[PDB]
Every structure is written in structure tokens, then in C-alpha cells.
């Protein structure tokens, strides 16, 4: 269909993928660092969600270089994804409006 809606859907699928690889790689990055808490997968996936929506309570966060790099990727992927949706909703609204007139 319309490009904007395809880019949106694509971004959402990709986000779900970044959340899962992000959870996997965070645990992999953080185990081995004394004091780290981002070390079991169920809570890491939750950590990935709250990082992507940029909510960041946090209750958990990375302390190593690679966990932080993985964190930045999750952030960016979520901020970009949510931004692509807004943008598509604007495209849709601009079109229907030019019609309503």
C-alpha cells in the first residue's frame, strides 16, 4: 500500500526484533560485570521495552560499555519507530484533509 504505512509496519517489526536481540545481547554484555543487574532474559526484555519507549524507570540499566551501546541502539530504534508512526499519521491526515476541502 502507501509507502508511509509500509515504513511504519516495517519499523514495528524491526522494533520487535531489536527488543529481542537487545535483550539477548544485554545479558551477554552484562554478565561478567560485578554488580550488574541486567543479567536474566525476562527482566532484560522488560528493560528493553522501557528503554525503547524512553520511559527508563531506572529499576534496571546497563553498566558495561557493550550493554550501553546495545542500550543506545534500542533507544534509537524505538525513537525512530515511534517517530515513523507519527509521521505516517501526519501523511494520512494531510491527504484526507486536502480531500475534505
Amino acid at each position, epitope marked *: 500500500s502507501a509507502l508511509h504505512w509500509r515504513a511504519a509496519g516495517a519499523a514495528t517489526v524491526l522494533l520487535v526484533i531489536v527488543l529481542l536481540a537487545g535483550s539477548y545481547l544485554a*545479558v*551477554l554484555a*552484562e*554478565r*561478567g560485570a*560485578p554488580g550488574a543487574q541486567l*543479567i*536474566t*532474559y525476562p527482566r532484560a526484555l522488560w528493560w528493553a521495552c522501557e528503554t525503547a519507549t524512553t520511559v527508563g524507570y531506572x529499576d534496571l540499566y546497563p553498566v558495561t560499555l557493550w550493554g550501553r551501546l546495545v542500550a543506545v541502539v534500542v533507544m534509537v530504534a524505538g525513537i525512530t519507530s515511534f517517530g515513523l508512526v507519527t509521521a505516517a499519521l501526519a501523511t494520512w491526515f494531510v491527504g484526507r484533509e486536502q480531500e475534505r476541502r
Partner: antibody
Amino acid sequence: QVQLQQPGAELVKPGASVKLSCKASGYTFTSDWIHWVKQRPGHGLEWIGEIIPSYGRANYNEKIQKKATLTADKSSSTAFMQLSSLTSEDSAVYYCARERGDGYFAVWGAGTTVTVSS
Amino acid sequence: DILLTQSPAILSVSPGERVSFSCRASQSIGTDIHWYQQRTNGSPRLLIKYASESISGIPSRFSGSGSGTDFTLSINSVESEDIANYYCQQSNRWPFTFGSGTKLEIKR
């Protein structure tokens, strides 16, 4: 059926090195970690290290001297622990255990009794 | 790293009585504590996970409770097969660590 199979025993001479194995069966996931735990006669459980077979990375207990090196074999579903340059201090039962990445050792091997003697 | 203190190291109870093993963490670990049973010559056996969650195959008699730094493993009406050593283990922070162990003894 038995999930983690380990040899019953190993005899090692002071200074020599031995490599223990742990053959895993049953459900295997990309998120499994294989841990090694050391128990000396009468005493408690001491964590040695862990490895994630699907990626090959291992971490070690930093509060103790490093006698171990862990490796895994994806094809043969076997994790190995190379103990090297042993002394009587290294004689104990060594268990492998499996963790589904959620923090608890759901299942343990029967343990390999290691004896360091001339 | 997280120190898990199990005290007393030996607990003596009368057949059928209520027993409670204690595990105290050096800092707060939510409910990330797990309990194991290791009988003489046996390998450890998971009894309770995440402080209070039951495991399949474990008698209903076994229960756990606590959150934060203080944890208890309880046995309702202890029996002979419960004679063993009991360990707690935390997974809240790296690296995982074990408590030193409590032995259950029965007075018959």
C-alpha cells in the same frame, strides 16, 4: 531422562591438567547457560564460572584463583571445563548445572569426583 | 559481591514439627533467591524458585517466603526424607552466589 551427563571420576597428579565434560540432553535453547560448581568434602557449593554455548562466552568467579577455562561444542551438545596445574586444593566434586537464563539451576549433573594425588 | 548468610548452620526438630531455614542477603535482592536440597551423596535439587514459587515434583509441604534481604524456606511437618543440607542462591546481581548451608537434623 538424565539431562546432564558427567564422568564419575578423574585422577590427576599434582601439576597436571584435566578436562571435565558435561553432555546435555533434552530441550536446548539459545538462552541456556551451563555453570560449574565446586564442592569440597563436607563443605558447601562454590560457583566457578559459566558459559553460554550458543555464543561461546564464559565468565569466571573473580574471588578465587582461575584454574578453569570453559568451552562448549554445539554439534555434540557438550560443555567442557579445563582445570589446569592442580594441587590437593583442587580435589572435590565438580557439578555442571543448567540455567535457562532466568537465574536458577533447574538441573544438575551427578558430579565428577576429581582427586589430585601422586 | 552478595553475601548470603544461612544461620543457624544446623537445625534440630522433632518429627512432624514445623521447621524454618533462614537466609539473609548483605543487600536487597527483591525475590531473586532460590532454594536447593542436597541429601548425603546426592546432587543439589531445586525446591523453590524466586523465593516463593513452587516447583513440580516437590512435596507441597515445602514453602518459601520473604523479599528484600530476609528469606525463609519452610517445611510443614518435617519427615525423615527431609534430612539434608539446604542452600539458598541469589540471581539478582552478578555473580550468582550461594549461602553456606543449613543442615536439617531430626530428633527421634
